[PDB]
């Protein structure tokens with residue numbers, strides 16, 4: 001009886017993902033994920049980014065665990081790690097913009113936008129799986 | 133008899149721009165611009181970027197003075213200055229990619245791609261105007 005991820009979480013490449021059914025502001029989304037020992041999703045591979053971008057298209061704009069709330073124009077994941085050069089290609093054309101006003105990052109369409117953190121959007125949690 | 137820019141060069145915001153009629157590889161484009169005391173275009177304002185992106189759409193993919201030939205994934209203008217955070221929004225979705233293989237930057241459509249430097253593309257030169 002191999003259970004890769006908890007009930008209603010999805011396994012992808014050694015991690016477990018939870019796709020919210022409701023919409024919350026960015027900070028509340030962060031908190032929701034911490035409630036289940038997880039983090040508002042931190043993207044770390046292209047296959048992961050591809051899967052979360054597709055899934056998120058079916059619901060609508062969706063938060064990820066990325067923001068420049070600490071220092072404008074510097075984007076940090078919720079675990080404090082820096083956004084790598086190779087991931088900057090995921091930004092949509094024209095993003096990030098409205099710097100200092102739109103401080104949190106969302107999947108929008110086929111890439112990332114920065115958006116106003118107070119907006120309510122879907123969100124995704126990620127934590128490690130338990131292998132079999 | 134006020135002449136803002138030399139013959140067949142276009143004035144925009146204190147600078148003079150030359151739009152090639154032929155296509156050259158990136159290095160040859162750099163050299164062409166140096167022949168006329170100019171530089172393969174270094175973008176320094178949004179109004180400038182807007183104007184060069186529109187004009188370049190009418191001809192086809194066009195080189196700008198930007199490349200990561202010195203150090204992969206670090207993009208420097210031809211005068212050695214670094215690419216600012218605010219200009220990274222000009223990259224098309226999915227760019228820059230093919231890192232280390234596509235080392236020079238072009239206007240493509242409505243944003244920037246990195247491309248193989250050996251390809252022949254149009255190009256644009258920029259130098260200071262002489263005020264009146």
Ligand SMILES: [Ca+2]
Pocket residue numbers: 095096097098102113114115
């Ligand atoms: Ca935005």
Ligand SMILES: [Ca+2]
Pocket residue numbers: 227228229230234245246247
């Ligand atoms: Ca490319």
